[PDB]
Design a protein around this nucleic acid. Sequence first.
DNA 1: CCGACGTCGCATCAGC
DNA 2: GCTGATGCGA
DNA 3: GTCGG
Length: 326
Amino acid sequence: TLNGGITDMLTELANFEKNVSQAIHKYNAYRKAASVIAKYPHKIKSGAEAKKLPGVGTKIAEKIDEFLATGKLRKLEKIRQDDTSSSINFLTRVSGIGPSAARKFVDEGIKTLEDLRKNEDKLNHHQRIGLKYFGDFEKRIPREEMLQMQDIVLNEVKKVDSEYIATVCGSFRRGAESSGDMDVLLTHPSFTSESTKQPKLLHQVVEQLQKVHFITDTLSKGETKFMGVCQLPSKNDEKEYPHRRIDIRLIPKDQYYCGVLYFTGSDIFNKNMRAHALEKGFTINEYTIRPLGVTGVAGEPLPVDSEKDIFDYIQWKYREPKDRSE
DNA sequence: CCGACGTCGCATCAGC
DNA sequence: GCTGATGCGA
DNA sequence: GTCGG
Ligand SMILES: Nc1ncnc2c1ncn2[C@H]1C[C@H](O)[C@@H](COP(=O)(O)CP(=O)(O)OP(=O)(O)O)O1
Ligand SMILES: [Cl-]
Ligand SMILES: [Cl-]
Ligand SMILES: [Cl-]
Ligand SMILES: [Cl-]
Ligand SMILES: [Mg+2]
Ligand SMILES: [Mg+2]
Ligand code: NA
Ligand code: NA
């Protein structure tokens, strides 16, 4: 937080462009600038100094000058005033509610936490759960609780089958002292890019996690992805821990490295790494890295034996998880 | 200029 | 039932 | 909103 004020302004501007203007390009632009400015080792002194950083053009440079001189931004001040803007922005904070659904509700007269409760009937399952744990999902998870959560997951997974390998990724693997949620990468030798020797692989795990009452709710569930809710167990007379979001991703074992790279993120890092990949003639996803033909066509998977192999193909120095928090 | 700016799983809808 | 677009999220 | 060709 050397330039915490500036990166917050741009983040607010990004959230506004995405939730209200439904303009993700302006969204990505602001996110990028906030990112590049967040890793800047100096205390920005002007818009011009910031403009030297890639991603900060003229418009943002001007906005930075204003912020520095007054400690605020009029454009955002007005946005905070506007009731529709603030209402939409607010509703998008409910898990499962996006710009579209937010603007729809405000068009129907639903614009507060109270309005959502007395209209639960208009929400799909996901939105209902996001509302039910609204306060809870707004809280950060101390690493200490992440560790206890890690332990429960790995151990409950081992009990279903010793061959399952569960790895906690996301901001946790990047070393954050706190996380917004828990992300779990799962692998089993019975599921490779060549065949699915077993069914209900993710199910069995989710099932066991529910059995021990760790997983409390489900937001969505397929054969390789599970998005839900979990809660650490508490002591006698001890207050309950908040419910937490939990994501599970089953990836073909032979595609592990590509999978853990993806799931470690951050999201912006992935976008940048993948963008850079395309310029170097490759395309990367959570399964593989394939070379692109002159006609823009995904070639066949390339051999990968480590995360570092992916960075090499694109000619990037390897970067430790703790340095991929862009 | 001014067009390009990662990738994909699941829930839901419309159309058939 | 299906496919395919869209919303929302990882 | 910013960038490179
Ligand atoms: N838009 C996107 N494009 C590409 N990859 C994306 C992505 N959103 C999420 N990911 C990937 C990388 C995240 O680390 C990882 C976890 O997704 P996540 O939403 O849990 C965010 P995380 O980075 O874990 O921080 P935190 O706020 O949860 O503590 O999923
Ligand atoms: Cl846009
Ligand atoms: Cl402001
Ligand atoms: Cl891989
Ligand atoms: Cl692939
Ligand atoms: Mg996370
Ligand atoms: Mg997550
Ligand atoms: Na710049
Ligand atoms: Na939301």
